Structure 1
Amino acid sequence: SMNPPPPETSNPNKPKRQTNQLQYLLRVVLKTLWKHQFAWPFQQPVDAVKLNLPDYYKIIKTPMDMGTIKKRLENNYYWNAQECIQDFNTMFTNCYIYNKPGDDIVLMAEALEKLFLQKINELPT
């Protein structure tokens, strides 16, 4: 297929461990972004076939989306909050490097990123 396998979302041999920051990332950050009116293009991996983006996975080396992040948080896949923050950053970077500035998708990403950064400003210690 034009599309890669989706990113892994479970780690069967990793111990389960919560942190205050991981709780915040799921229950505050992800939840707020997931419900936002602009979330829909970011709730699942980019399907380059259906969206007619034949060069997407040539350009984007590290695919990322909020459906993957959500499942990773729910499955306790991340060892620490910084790994999760990096996935959010990667998802936004992918959007900004692939799509033309001023494309609707870019303005949506920017609105979501602004909300993300505001919540990250209040990340627990």
Structure 2
Amino acid sequence: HHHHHLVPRGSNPPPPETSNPNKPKRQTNQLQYLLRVVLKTLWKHQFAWPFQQPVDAVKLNLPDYYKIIKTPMDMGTIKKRLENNYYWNAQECIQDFNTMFTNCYIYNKPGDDIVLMAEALEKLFLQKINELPTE
């Protein structure tokens, strides 16, 4: 038999939403800080690049990635959500960052370059979180 299962192919899943008209949203001091300070400082960091977009498992030849990671998250998505005022409070945005970092620690092994990157970005994240406005 001449069906060799070379098709259909893999794909990336649809990315997380960055808009949702029926989701409750607010602008708050803490969320403005999360954009202007937290996100924009991490974004410009030389370790940000693996985290600036939804994981392209096809390009990166990581065919197990979405088998293991069922709650993907990335800073491109977070940036767009903040630009679009998607969040109700700071907790929802912080949880997105925590998901991103946790995914990295699940998927990879301690000492991998990508884990060293996430650790540095997380350290910076936590330092900036400690100066969140308390008004």
User: TM-score under structure 2 normalisation?
Assistant: 0.88
Per the alignment, residue 129 of structure 2 pairs with 120
CA distance in 1, matches of 2:97, 2:24: 23
The answer to whether the 8 A contact 2:26-2:89 is kept is no
Unaligned runs of 5+ in 1: none
**Superimposed CA distance per residue, residues 29-62 of structure 1 (whole angstroms, 9 cap, x where no aligned partner):** 0010000111000000111111111111011010
User: TM-score under structure 1 normalisation?
Assistant: 0.94
**Superimposed CA distance per residue, residues 83-115 of structure 1 (whole angstroms, 9 cap, x where no aligned partner):** 000000000000001011111000000000000
Unaligned runs of 5+ in 2: 1-11
Check 1:99–1:15 CA distance in 2 against 1; reply closer, same or farther (3 A cut): closer
**Superimposed CA distance per residue, residues 13-38 of structure 1 (whole angstroms, 9 cap, x where no aligned partner):** 45653101000000000010000111
The runs of 4+ residues in structure 1 deviating greater than 3 Å are 13-16
The answer to whether the 8 A contact 2:24-2:87 is kept is no
Alignment partner of 1:101: what SS?
Answer: coil
How many corresponding residue pairs?
123
Q: Which moved more, 1:48-57 or 1:64-73?
A: 48-57
**Structure 1 position 11, deviation (Å):** 2.0
Identity %: 100
The answer to whether the 8 A contact 2:108-2:114 is kept is yes
Q: Which moved more, 1:12-21 or 1:42-51?
A: 12-21
Check 1:91–1:73 CA distance in 2 against 1; reply closer, same or farther (3 A cut): same
For the pair shown, the structure with the greater C-alpha radius of gyration is 2
